[PDB]
mmCIF file with all atom_site columns, C-alpha atoms in Angstrom:
data_model
loop_
_atom_site.group_PDB
_atom_site.id
_atom_site.type_symbol
_atom_site.label_atom_id
_atom_site.label_alt_id
_atom_site.label_comp_id
_atom_site.label_asym_id
_atom_site.label_entity_id
_atom_site.label_seq_id
_atom_site.pdbx_PDB_ins_code
_atom_site.Cartn_x
_atom_site.Cartn_y
_atom_site.Cartn_z
_atom_site.occupancy
_atom_site.B_iso_or_equiv
_atom_site.pdbx_formal_charge
_atom_site.auth_seq_id
_atom_site.auth_comp_id
_atom_site.auth_asym_id
_atom_site.auth_atom_id
_atom_site.pdbx_PDB_model_num
ATOM 1   C CA . UNK A 1 1   ? 16.721 4.235   43.725 1.00 52.41 ? 7   UNK A CA 1
ATOM 2   C CA . UNK A 1 2   ? 15.178 1.784   46.210 1.00 52.67 ? 8   UNK A CA 1
ATOM 3   C CA . UNK A 1 3   ? 12.413 3.482   48.235 1.00 51.54 ? 9   UNK A CA 1
ATOM 4   C CA . UNK A 1 4   ? 12.832 4.165   51.949 1.00 50.73 ? 10  UNK A CA 1
ATOM 5   C CA . UNK A 1 5   ? 9.787  4.127   54.208 1.00 51.53 ? 11  UNK A CA 1
ATOM 6   C CA . UNK A 1 6   ? 9.476  4.950   57.905 1.00 51.45 ? 12  UNK A CA 1
ATOM 7   C CA . UNK A 1 7   ? 7.292  3.868   60.791 1.00 48.97 ? 13  UNK A CA 1
ATOM 8   C CA . UNK A 1 8   ? 6.946  6.017   63.901 1.00 46.03 ? 14  UNK A CA 1
ATOM 9   C CA . UNK A 1 9   ? 6.257  3.562   66.727 1.00 44.65 ? 15  UNK A CA 1
ATOM 10  C CA . UNK A 1 10  ? 4.222  4.233   69.864 1.00 45.34 ? 16  UNK A CA 1
ATOM 11  C CA . UNK A 1 11  ? 3.811  2.163   73.014 1.00 47.91 ? 17  UNK A CA 1
ATOM 12  C CA . UNK A 1 12  ? 0.423  2.648   74.697 1.00 50.53 ? 18  UNK A CA 1
ATOM 13  C CA . UNK A 1 13  ? 0.283  5.933   72.788 1.00 49.47 ? 19  UNK A CA 1
ATOM 14  C CA . UNK A 1 14  ? 3.680  7.200   73.963 1.00 45.63 ? 20  UNK A CA 1
ATOM 15  C CA . UNK A 1 15  ? 6.233  7.845   71.209 1.00 48.32 ? 21  UNK A CA 1
ATOM 16  C CA . UNK A 1 16  ? 9.064  5.305   71.161 1.00 47.32 ? 22  UNK A CA 1
ATOM 17  C CA . UNK A 1 17  ? 11.033 6.139   68.025 1.00 49.81 ? 23  UNK A CA 1
ATOM 18  C CA . UNK A 1 18  ? 11.355 5.756   64.272 1.00 53.80 ? 24  UNK A CA 1
ATOM 19  C CA . UNK A 1 19  ? 12.362 2.748   62.190 1.00 56.09 ? 25  UNK A CA 1
ATOM 20  C CA . UNK A 1 20  ? 13.155 3.153   58.512 1.00 57.11 ? 26  UNK A CA 1
ATOM 21  C CA . UNK A 1 21  ? 13.348 0.405   55.899 1.00 58.67 ? 27  UNK A CA 1
ATOM 22  C CA . UNK A 1 22  ? 14.950 0.022   52.519 1.00 57.64 ? 28  UNK A CA 1
ATOM 23  C CA . UNK A 1 23  ? 12.596 -1.825  50.187 1.00 59.18 ? 29  UNK A CA 1
ATOM 24  C CA . UNK A 1 24  ? 14.278 -3.985  47.560 1.00 59.66 ? 30  UNK A CA 1
ATOM 25  C CA . UNK A 1 25  ? 12.290 -2.738  44.580 1.00 61.21 ? 31  UNK A CA 1
ATOM 26  C CA . UNK A 1 26  ? 15.179 -3.743  42.326 1.00 62.54 ? 32  UNK A CA 1
ATOM 27  C CA . UNK A 1 27  ? 14.701 -7.439  43.195 1.00 62.85 ? 33  UNK A CA 1
ATOM 28  C CA . UNK A 1 28  ? 11.042 -7.746  44.258 1.00 65.58 ? 34  UNK A CA 1
ATOM 29  C CA . UNK A 1 29  ? 9.216  -4.797  42.685 1.00 66.81 ? 35  UNK A CA 1
ATOM 30  C CA . UNK A 1 30  ? 5.653  -6.048  43.111 1.00 67.55 ? 36  UNK A CA 1
ATOM 31  C CA . UNK A 1 31  ? 6.128  -6.935  46.789 1.00 69.26 ? 37  UNK A CA 1
ATOM 32  C CA . UNK A 1 32  ? 8.083  -3.750  47.560 1.00 69.80 ? 38  UNK A CA 1
ATOM 33  C CA . UNK A 1 33  ? 5.396  -1.627  45.925 1.00 72.44 ? 39  UNK A CA 1
ATOM 34  C CA . UNK A 1 34  ? 2.643  -3.178  48.035 1.00 70.07 ? 40  UNK A CA 1
ATOM 35  C CA . UNK A 1 35  ? 4.456  -2.310  51.266 1.00 69.26 ? 41  UNK A CA 1
ATOM 36  C CA . UNK A 1 36  ? 5.406  1.162   50.003 1.00 71.22 ? 42  UNK A CA 1
ATOM 37  C CA . UNK A 1 37  ? 1.854  2.063   49.044 1.00 71.72 ? 43  UNK A CA 1
ATOM 38  C CA . UNK A 1 38  ? 0.434  0.670   52.281 1.00 68.91 ? 44  UNK A CA 1
ATOM 39  C CA . UNK A 1 39  ? 2.943  2.835   54.148 1.00 71.50 ? 45  UNK A CA 1
ATOM 40  C CA . UNK A 1 40  ? 1.934  6.052   52.362 1.00 74.70 ? 46  UNK A CA 1
ATOM 41  C CA . UNK A 1 41  ? -1.756 5.163   52.387 1.00 72.77 ? 47  UNK A CA 1
ATOM 42  C CA . UNK A 1 42  ? -2.099 6.499   48.843 1.00 76.59 ? 48  UNK A CA 1
ATOM 43  C CA . UNK A 1 43  ? -4.619 3.802   47.833 1.00 78.44 ? 49  UNK A CA 1
ATOM 44  C CA . UNK A 1 44  ? -6.941 4.854   50.658 1.00 80.75 ? 50  UNK A CA 1
ATOM 45  C CA . UNK A 1 45  ? -5.929 2.196   53.167 1.00 80.18 ? 51  UNK A CA 1
ATOM 46  C CA . UNK A 1 46  ? -2.741 1.044   54.834 1.00 81.42 ? 52  UNK A CA 1
ATOM 47  C CA . UNK A 1 47  ? -0.623 0.734   57.938 1.00 79.98 ? 53  UNK A CA 1
ATOM 48  C CA . UNK A 1 48  ? -1.128 4.038   59.763 1.00 79.69 ? 54  UNK A CA 1
ATOM 49  C CA . UNK A 1 49  ? -2.696 3.382   63.151 1.00 83.99 ? 55  UNK A CA 1
ATOM 50  C CA . UNK A 1 50  ? -2.291 -0.402  62.983 1.00 82.90 ? 56  UNK A CA 1
ATOM 51  C CA . UNK A 1 51  ? -0.593 -2.529  65.629 1.00 83.97 ? 57  UNK A CA 1
ATOM 52  C CA . UNK A 1 52  ? 2.107  -5.149  65.959 1.00 84.19 ? 58  UNK A CA 1
ATOM 53  C CA . UNK A 1 53  ? 0.002  -8.017  67.209 1.00 84.12 ? 59  UNK A CA 1
ATOM 54  C CA . UNK A 1 54  ? 2.655  -10.697 67.681 1.00 84.90 ? 60  UNK A CA 1
ATOM 55  C CA . UNK A 1 55  ? 6.141  -10.107 69.086 1.00 85.27 ? 61  UNK A CA 1
ATOM 56  C CA . UNK A 1 56  ? 8.349  -13.044 70.053 1.00 89.21 ? 62  UNK A CA 1
ATOM 57  C CA . UNK A 1 57  ? 11.697 -11.954 71.488 1.00 90.13 ? 63  UNK A CA 1
ATOM 58  C CA . UNK A 1 58  ? 14.616 -13.633 69.752 1.00 91.23 ? 64  UNK A CA 1
ATOM 59  C CA . UNK A 1 59  ? 12.490 -14.360 66.679 1.00 90.80 ? 65  UNK A CA 1
ATOM 60  C CA . UNK A 1 60  ? 10.404 -11.585 65.104 1.00 90.96 ? 66  UNK A CA 1
ATOM 61  C CA . UNK A 1 61  ? 7.913  -8.748  65.329 1.00 91.36 ? 67  UNK A CA 1
ATOM 62  C CA . UNK A 1 62  ? 4.805  -9.212  63.200 1.00 91.02 ? 68  UNK A CA 1
ATOM 63  C CA . UNK A 1 63  ? 2.335  -6.578  62.082 1.00 90.11 ? 69  UNK A CA 1
ATOM 64  C CA . UNK A 1 64  ? 0.324  -5.328  59.141 1.00 90.88 ? 70  UNK A CA 1
ATOM 65  C CA . UNK A 1 65  ? -3.130 -6.613  59.996 1.00 90.66 ? 71  UNK A CA 1
ATOM 66  C CA . UNK A 1 66  ? -4.891 -3.295  59.621 1.00 88.61 ? 72  UNK A CA 1
ATOM 67  C CA . UNK A 1 67  ? -8.412 -4.775  59.304 1.00 88.78 ? 73  UNK A CA 1
ATOM 68  C CA . UNK A 1 68  ? -8.657 -7.204  62.237 1.00 90.42 ? 74  UNK A CA 1
ATOM 69  C CA . UNK A 1 69  ? -5.654 -6.292  64.422 1.00 89.50 ? 75  UNK A CA 1
ATOM 70  C CA . UNK A 1 70  ? -4.894 -9.874  65.362 1.00 87.22 ? 76  UNK A CA 1
ATOM 71  C CA . UNK A 1 71  ? -3.315 -11.774 62.471 1.00 88.14 ? 77  UNK A CA 1
ATOM 72  C CA . UNK A 1 72  ? -6.525 -12.832 60.733 1.00 88.56 ? 78  UNK A CA 1
ATOM 73  C CA . UNK A 1 73  ? -6.929 -9.845  58.394 1.00 89.71 ? 79  UNK A CA 1
ATOM 74  C CA . UNK A 1 74  ? -5.202 -7.415  56.064 1.00 90.85 ? 80  UNK A CA 1
ATOM 75  C CA . UNK A 1 75  ? -5.239 -7.075  52.286 1.00 87.91 ? 81  UNK A CA 1
ATOM 76  C CA . UNK A 1 76  ? -2.829 -6.056  49.560 1.00 88.47 ? 82  UNK A CA 1
ATOM 77  C CA . UNK A 1 77  ? -3.125 -3.243  47.038 1.00 85.61 ? 83  UNK A CA 1
ATOM 78  C CA . UNK A 1 78  ? -3.669 -5.952  44.378 1.00 84.75 ? 84  UNK A CA 1
ATOM 79  C CA . UNK A 1 79  ? -6.598 -7.640  46.091 1.00 79.30 ? 85  UNK A CA 1
ATOM 80  C CA . UNK A 1 80  ? -7.053 -9.959  49.064 1.00 79.73 ? 86  UNK A CA 1
ATOM 81  C CA . UNK A 1 81  ? -3.939 -11.934 48.196 1.00 82.25 ? 87  UNK A CA 1
ATOM 82  C CA . UNK A 1 82  ? -1.075 -11.989 45.703 1.00 81.22 ? 88  UNK A CA 1
ATOM 83  C CA . UNK A 1 83  ? 1.516  -14.493 44.549 1.00 77.21 ? 89  UNK A CA 1
ATOM 84  C CA . UNK A 1 84  ? 4.971  -15.220 45.930 1.00 75.54 ? 90  UNK A CA 1
ATOM 85  C CA . UNK A 1 85  ? 7.041  -13.016 43.632 1.00 75.27 ? 91  UNK A CA 1
ATOM 86  C CA . UNK A 1 86  ? 10.380 -14.782 43.991 1.00 77.25 ? 92  UNK A CA 1
ATOM 87  C CA . UNK A 1 87  ? 12.686 -16.159 46.694 1.00 77.21 ? 93  UNK A CA 1
ATOM 88  C CA . UNK A 1 88  ? 15.933 -14.507 45.601 1.00 73.17 ? 94  UNK A CA 1
ATOM 89  C CA . UNK A 1 89  ? 16.616 -12.956 49.012 1.00 72.16 ? 95  UNK A CA 1
ATOM 90  C CA . UNK A 1 90  ? 17.157 -14.953 52.181 1.00 69.22 ? 96  UNK A CA 1
ATOM 91  C CA . UNK A 1 91  ? 16.520 -14.516 55.885 1.00 70.57 ? 97  UNK A CA 1
ATOM 92  C CA . UNK A 1 92  ? 20.118 -13.700 56.751 1.00 72.37 ? 98  UNK A CA 1
ATOM 93  C CA . UNK A 1 93  ? 19.761 -12.137 60.197 1.00 72.83 ? 99  UNK A CA 1
ATOM 94  C CA . UNK A 1 94  ? 18.160 -9.411  62.317 1.00 73.15 ? 100 UNK A CA 1
ATOM 95  C CA . UNK A 1 95  ? 16.510 -6.571  60.446 1.00 73.35 ? 101 UNK A CA 1
ATOM 96  C CA . UNK A 1 96  ? 15.152 -8.560  57.499 1.00 70.75 ? 102 UNK A CA 1
ATOM 97  C CA . UNK A 1 97  ? 11.620 -7.633  56.374 1.00 70.53 ? 103 UNK A CA 1
ATOM 98  C CA . UNK A 1 98  ? 9.607  -10.553 55.012 1.00 69.94 ? 104 UNK A CA 1
ATOM 99  C CA . UNK A 1 99  ? 5.977  -11.318 54.113 1.00 69.62 ? 105 UNK A CA 1
ATOM 100 C CA . UNK A 1 100 ? 3.748  -13.323 56.414 1.00 70.52 ? 106 UNK A CA 1
ATOM 101 C CA . UNK A 1 101 ? 1.478  -15.787 54.654 1.00 69.36 ? 107 UNK A CA 1
ATOM 102 C CA . UNK A 1 102 ? -0.878 -18.732 55.093 1.00 70.81 ? 108 UNK A CA 1
ATOM 103 C CA . UNK A 1 103 ? 0.360  -21.017 52.334 1.00 70.46 ? 109 UNK A CA 1
ATOM 104 C CA . UNK A 1 104 ? 1.754  -20.640 48.817 1.00 67.76 ? 110 UNK A CA 1
ATOM 105 C CA . UNK A 1 105 ? 0.699  -17.446 47.029 1.00 68.56 ? 111 UNK A CA 1
ATOM 106 C CA . UNK A 1 106 ? -1.250 -15.885 49.887 1.00 70.94 ? 112 UNK A CA 1
ATOM 107 C CA . UNK A 1 107 ? 0.537  -12.607 50.546 1.00 71.79 ? 113 UNK A CA 1
ATOM 108 C CA . UNK A 1 108 ? -1.618 -9.763  51.852 1.00 73.32 ? 114 UNK A CA 1
ATOM 109 C CA . UNK A 1 109 ? -0.414 -6.952  54.078 1.00 71.14 ? 115 UNK A CA 1
ATOM 110 C CA . UNK A 1 110 ? 1.084  -8.782  57.048 1.00 70.63 ? 116 UNK A CA 1
ATOM 111 C CA . UNK A 1 111 ? 4.847  -8.797  57.428 1.00 67.71 ? 117 UNK A CA 1
ATOM 112 C CA . UNK A 1 112 ? 7.489  -9.504  59.958 1.00 65.16 ? 118 UNK A CA 1
ATOM 113 C CA . UNK A 1 113 ? 10.723 -7.921  61.039 1.00 66.89 ? 119 UNK A CA 1
ATOM 114 C CA . UNK A 1 114 ? 13.207 -10.613 61.970 1.00 67.49 ? 120 UNK A CA 1
ATOM 115 C CA . UNK A 1 115 ? 15.215 -10.152 65.128 1.00 66.78 ? 121 UNK A CA 1
ATOM 116 C CA . UNK A 1 116 ? 17.273 -13.292 64.529 1.00 69.72 ? 122 UNK A CA 1
ATOM 117 C CA . UNK A 1 117 ? 18.470 -15.347 61.575 1.00 70.73 ? 123 UNK A CA 1
ATOM 118 C CA . UNK A 1 118 ? 15.473 -17.416 60.464 1.00 69.00 ? 124 UNK A CA 1
ATOM 119 C CA . UNK A 1 119 ? 16.854 -19.621 57.709 1.00 71.69 ? 125 UNK A CA 1
ATOM 120 C CA . UNK A 1 120 ? 14.036 -22.180 57.874 1.00 72.41 ? 126 UNK A CA 1
ATOM 121 C CA . UNK A 1 121 ? 11.769 -19.529 56.297 1.00 73.66 ? 127 UNK A CA 1
ATOM 122 C CA . UNK A 1 122 ? 13.912 -19.311 53.153 1.00 73.91 ? 128 UNK A CA 1
ATOM 123 C CA . UNK A 1 123 ? 11.962 -20.303 50.069 1.00 71.85 ? 129 UNK A CA 1
ATOM 124 C CA . UNK A 1 124 ? 8.650  -19.999 51.947 1.00 70.98 ? 130 UNK A CA 1
ATOM 125 C CA . UNK A 1 125 ? 8.366  -16.271 52.777 1.00 69.33 ? 131 UNK A CA 1
ATOM 126 C CA . UNK A 1 126 ? 9.295  -13.505 50.374 1.00 68.93 ? 132 UNK A CA 1
ATOM 127 C CA . UNK A 1 127 ? 12.038 -11.242 51.697 1.00 70.83 ? 133 UNK A CA 1
ATOM 128 C CA . UNK A 1 128 ? 11.615 -7.708  50.400 1.00 69.78 ? 134 UNK A CA 1
ATOM 129 C CA . UNK A 1 129 ? 13.433 -5.222  52.595 1.00 74.48 ? 135 UNK A CA 1
ATOM 130 C CA . UNK A 1 130 ? 15.621 -4.516  55.585 1.00 79.03 ? 136 UNK A CA 1
ATOM 131 C CA . UNK A 1 131 ? 15.816 -2.102  58.496 1.00 76.59 ? 137 UNK A CA 1
ATOM 132 C CA . UNK A 1 132 ? 18.031 0.852   57.510 1.00 80.29 ? 138 UNK A CA 1
ATOM 133 C CA . UNK A 1 133 ? 17.807 3.066   60.598 1.00 79.36 ? 139 UNK A CA 1
ATOM 134 C CA . UNK A 1 134 ? 16.384 2.409   64.016 1.00 78.57 ? 140 UNK A CA 1
ATOM 135 C CA . UNK A 1 135 ? 17.223 -1.242  64.601 1.00 78.61 ? 141 UNK A CA 1
ATOM 136 C CA . UNK A 1 136 ? 17.589 -0.104  68.220 1.00 75.72 ? 142 UNK A CA 1
ATOM 137 C CA . UNK A 1 137 ? 13.900 0.837   68.144 1.00 79.89 ? 143 UNK A CA 1
ATOM 138 C CA . UNK A 1 138 ? 13.017 -2.677  66.920 1.00 77.22 ? 144 UNK A CA 1
ATOM 139 C CA . UNK A 1 139 ? 15.099 -4.073  69.774 1.00 74.52 ? 145 UNK A CA 1
ATOM 140 C CA . UNK A 1 140 ? 13.160 -1.846  72.181 1.00 75.88 ? 146 UNK A CA 1
ATOM 141 C CA . UNK A 1 141 ? 9.830  -3.109  70.782 1.00 74.32 ? 147 UNK A CA 1
ATOM 142 C CA . UNK A 1 142 ? 10.979 -6.657  71.222 1.00 75.70 ? 148 UNK A CA 1
ATOM 143 C CA . UNK A 1 143 ? 11.021 -6.205  74.990 1.00 76.20 ? 149 UNK A CA 1
ATOM 144 C CA . UNK A 1 144 ? 7.236  -5.816  75.028 1.00 73.58 ? 150 UNK A CA 1
ATOM 145 C CA . UNK A 1 145 ? 6.768  -9.267  73.501 1.00 72.65 ? 151 UNK A CA 1
ATOM 146 C CA . UNK A 1 146 ? 6.518  -12.676 75.134 1.00 70.25 ? 152 UNK A CA 1
ATOM 147 C CA . UNK A 1 147 ? 7.040  -16.360 74.375 1.00 72.59 ? 153 UNK A CA 1
ATOM 148 C CA . UNK A 1 148 ? 3.505  -16.803 73.051 1.00 71.72 ? 154 UNK A CA 1
ATOM 149 C CA . UNK A 1 149 ? 3.693  -13.532 71.107 1.00 73.76 ? 155 UNK A CA 1
ATOM 150 C CA . UNK A 1 150 ? 1.190  -11.526 73.148 1.00 71.88 ? 156 UNK A CA 1
ATOM 151 C CA . UNK A 1 151 ? 2.371  -7.976  73.811 1.00 75.98 ? 157 UNK A CA 1
ATOM 152 C CA . UNK A 1 152 ? 2.384  -6.452  77.286 1.00 75.84 ? 158 UNK A CA 1
ATOM 153 C CA . UNK A 1 153 ? 1.624  -2.988  75.903 1.00 74.91 ? 159 UNK A CA 1
ATOM 154 C CA . UNK A 1 154 ? -0.055 -1.858  72.702 1.00 75.48 ? 160 UNK A CA 1
ATOM 155 C CA . UNK A 1 155 ? 2.570  -1.322  70.010 1.00 75.91 ? 161 UNK A CA 1
ATOM 156 C CA . UNK A 1 156 ? 1.284  0.852   67.159 1.00 75.58 ? 162 UNK A CA 1
ATOM 157 C CA . UNK A 1 157 ? 2.426  2.518   63.965 1.00 75.22 ? 163 UNK A CA 1
ATOM 158 C CA . UNK A 1 158 ? 1.507  6.061   64.938 1.00 74.73 ? 164 UNK A CA 1
ATOM 159 C CA . UNK A 1 159 ? 2.651  7.486   61.607 1.00 75.27 ? 165 UNK A CA 1
ATOM 160 C CA . UNK A 1 160 ? 4.263  6.113   58.465 1.00 74.67 ? 166 UNK A CA 1
ATOM 161 C CA . UNK A 1 161 ? 5.245  7.234   55.000 1.00 75.86 ? 167 UNK A CA 1
ATOM 162 C CA . UNK A 1 162 ? 8.005  7.496   52.456 1.00 76.30 ? 168 UNK A CA 1
ATOM 163 C CA . UNK A 1 163 ? 11.259 9.346   53.104 1.00 74.14 ? 169 UNK A CA 1
ATOM 164 C CA . UNK A 1 164 ? 12.987 8.769   49.806 1.00 75.91 ? 170 UNK A CA 1
#
């Protein structure tokens, strides 16, 4: 029942591989739907062609800023921002998909993929999915990050959509 979406990742334009995510629509429907629709582009905007602008090895990969490409932009399908839906799910380890934000009730389009357990984010960032296939591809991406988050090569979502 829960939707599955995929990202095809490229590194300086060269294909790297595919990561797929289960979105927990059963627990966080509003947040899952935002990510799903941004992945298919059905609203006329979304993730295709956007980059991962901040990658910190041993912590997370952050992306979703499709308007400014640097962590200062993005928007949701509901408007500039939407509320924190709930905090039922926790940051339990690598592979968790969670919303980036700039304070309470400021979700847009930015998200991160955790590559470690990040329990200090529990109750602050809405967890809404997990990597299903291709965690090895996330691990490969991680190697292009750095301590300050700057990437050594351009990491992009070359294609994305819904599988199921």
